[PDB]
C-alpha cells in the first residue's frame, strides 16, 4: 500500500552477446565490435596513386625488357606492384637471374623508375651490335628479338672480337639499377662463331664493386629450344659512382637502365582486378574501409590498416548484462 522507490538498471531488445572469463554468451545492452572481417575484393589507389599492373609479365620480364613486355616499357611510378600469378613473360632466353630474391626486395622498396640509355651501342668498338637476337625472345611482331635493356654483342664479320670498353659516371641524384649478362654457349662451335677463339672474360667494377666471369661451355637441357644459357646480373650504381666495363667476348651488355627512387612497399601476387577507386588500406586480398582496430583479412598490406589477428570476433561489452522482462 505504501509509496515506493526502487533502484534498478537498463534493459533493452539487444540479443548481442559477449564472452567473459567467467561466462560465455552473455547478452549485453551495448557493445562494440573491434574486429573487421569484411573487404572489397579489388585493388585501389593508395594515397591517390595507382598501382603497377604487370599484366602478362613477371617482374623479371618487366625490368629486363622482355620484348613482349613493351607495354610496360619506359617510366613508371607506383604505390605498390601487382604481379599476376600466371604471367608468362619473364626470362625468355634460359638462364638464372642471380640474386633474384634480393632484386625483388630492392624493386619492392621503390616508388618510381626512369628508364634511360646508359650505354649507347656506339660504346663498344669493333663489334656487331645489330645481330644480338634469338628465336627464344620474340616480340609480338618479330620471331627473333632480344631484351630491350640489354645488347647481345657478337663478332663482326671479320677480325675476331676485340677488347671492348665502356664507362658511365653517375652524376645524378638517384641510384641507377642496371643489368648485364654472360653468355654460355652449348658448344665450342657456337663459342667460335659468335666470339673469337681464345680465352674470353667479362669484367666490371665500380668504386665499391668487382665482377669477373668467363664462359662455361656445356649443353644444358633445352629450354625454349636453347641448350645454351645466359647468366644474368643486376647491380646498383650509387650517386657519384662510375662503372667500368671490359670484355673479351660473351658479354651481354647493359644498354638501358633505371634511375631509381625509393616507406612501406608491396609486391602483391594476386589476380584481383584493379579498379578506379581509392583506398586508405590495401590488403593482398582486398580493400579494408573501416575504423575498426583489428582485422582478420590478411597480414599482408600497404597503407594504414588495422592489426591482423586470427580472431573471428573481438566484441567489447560497454553496456550491462541485459535482463529484460
Amino acid at each position: 500500500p505504501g509509496d515506493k522507490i526502487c533502484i534498478g538498471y537498463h534493459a533493452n531488445n539487444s540479443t548481442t552477446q559477449v564472452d567473459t572469463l567467467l561466462e560465455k554468451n552473455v547478452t549485453v545492452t551495448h557493445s562494440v565490435e573491434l574486429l573487421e572481417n569484411q573487404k572489397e575484393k579489388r585493388f585501389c589507389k593508395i594515397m591517390n596513386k595507382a598501382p603497377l599492373d604487370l599484366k602478362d609479365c613477371t617482374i623479371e620480364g618487366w625490368i629486363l625488357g622482355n620484348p613482349k613486355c613493351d607495354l610496360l616499357l619506359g617510366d613508371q611510378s607506383w604505390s605498390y606492384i601487382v604481379e599476376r600469378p600466371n604471367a608468362q613473360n619473364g626470362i625468355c632466353y634460359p638462364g638464372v637471374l642471380n640474386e633474384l630474391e634480393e632484386l625483388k626486395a630492392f624493386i619492392g622498396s621503390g616508388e618510381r623508375v626512369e628508364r634511360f640509355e646508359m650505354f649507347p651501342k656506339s660504346t663498344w668498338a669493333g663489334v656487331d651490335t645489330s645481330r644480338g637476337v634469338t628465336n627464344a625472345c620474340p616480340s609480338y611482331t618479330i620471331d627473333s628479338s632480344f631484351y630491350r635493356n640489354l645488347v647481345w654483342i657478337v663478332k663482326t664479320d671479320s677480325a675476331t672480337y676485340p677488347v671492348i670498353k665502356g664507362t658511365y659516371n653517375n652524376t645524378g641524384t638517384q641510384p641507377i639499377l642496371y643489368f648485364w649478362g654472360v653468355h654460355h654457349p652449348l658448344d665450342t662451335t657456337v663459342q667460335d662463331n659468335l666470339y673469337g677463339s681464345g680465352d674470353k672474360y667479362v669484367r666490371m667494377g665500380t668504386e665499391s664493386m668487382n665482377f669477373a666471369k668467363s664462359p662455361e661451355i656445356a649443353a644444358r637441357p633445352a629450354v625454349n629450344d636453347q641448350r645454351s644459357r645466359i647468366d644474368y646480373y643486376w647491380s646498383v650504381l650509387r650517386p657519384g659512382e662510375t662503372l667500368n666495363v671490359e670484355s673479351n667476348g660473351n658479354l651481354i651488355a647493359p644498354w638501358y637502365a633505371y634511375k631509381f627512387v625509393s616507406k612501406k612497399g608491396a609486391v602483391f601476387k594476386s589476380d584481383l582486378p584493379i579498379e578506379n577507386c581509392d583506398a586508405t588500406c590495401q590488403t593482398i586480398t582486398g580493400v579494408l574501409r573501416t575504423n575498426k582496430t583489428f582485422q582478420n583479412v590478411s597480414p599482408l598490406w600497404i597503407g594504414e590498416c588495422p592489426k591482423y589477428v586470427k580472431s573471428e570476433s573481438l566484441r567489447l561489452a560497454t553496456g550491462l548484462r541485459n535482463v529484460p522482462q
Binding site: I5, G8, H10, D19, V26, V309, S311, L314, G319
Partner: protein, 172 residues
C-alpha cells in the same frame, strides 16, 4: 554478479528506463515511472569510453609481414621468417582475445558496483522512514509526493521532515 545487484538481489532490468544505465522506479498516488540517475550514468559512460579508447590506443601498432621470396638454398631463413611472423601473430591474437575476456568480466562488475552504490545511496537517505524490501525497493512509511521522490533522486531528501509521520505508521 560480484557486487550482487545486477541479476542478483535486483532480479531483472527495466526495459522502461530508456535514458540511462542506472536509475529509479517510483510508485505513488500520482503515478509510476522511471528516471535515469544522470550523474552515475554519465560517470560510467566516461569511464567506459576511456577504457575502450585506451585499449584502441595501446593496440595501435602493427606487426608487418612482408612476403619476401626465398631461394631453394634459403629454407632456413625462409622458415625463420615464417616462424617469426607466425610467432607475433600468435602473441597479438592471444593479447587481444584475453584482454577482451578479462575486460568484459570487469566491465560487467563495474556496472554491478554502480547499481549497488546507487542503492546504498538511497538506503542511507531514507533510514527508517522506509522499509528495505529484498529487491532494491523501498516502501515508504509516509506519503511520498512527486517532489518527495525528486528529493530522493536528488540526494536532498529530508528525513526529519517525515520522521514523525513515519513512526506513527511504522508502529501503527
Amino acid at each position: 554478479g560480484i557486487f550482487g545487484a545486477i541479476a542478483g538481489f535486483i532480479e531483472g532490468g527495466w526495459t522502461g528506463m530508456i535514458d540511462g544505465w542506472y536509475g529509479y522506479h517510483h510508485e505513488n498516488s500520482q503515478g509510476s515511472g522511471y528516471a535515469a540517475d544522470r550523474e552515475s550514468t554519465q560517470k560510467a559512460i566516461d569511464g567506459i569510453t576511456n577504457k575502450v579508447n585506451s585499449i584502441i590506443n595501446k593496440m595501435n601498432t602493427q606487426f608487418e609481414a612482408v612476403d619476401h621470396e626465398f631461394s631453394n638454398l634459403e629454407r632456413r631463413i625462409g622458415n625463420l621468417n615464417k616462424r617469426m611472423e607466425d610467432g607475433f601473430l600468435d602473441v597479438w591474437t592471444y593479447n587481444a582475445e584475453l584482454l577482451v575476456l578479462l575486460e568484459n568480466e570487469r566491465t560487467l562488475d563495474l556496472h554491478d558496483a554502480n547499481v549497488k552504490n546507487l542503492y546504498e545511496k538511497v538506503k542511507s537517505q531514507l533510514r527508517d522512514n522506509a522499509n528495505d524490501l529484498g529487491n532494491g525497493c523501498f516502501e515508504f512509511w509516509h506519503k511520498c509526493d512527486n517532489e518527495c521522490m525528486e528529493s530522493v533522486k536528488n540526494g536532498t531528501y529530508d528525513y526529519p521532515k517525515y520522521q514523525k509521520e513515519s513512526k506513527l505508521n511504522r508502529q501503527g
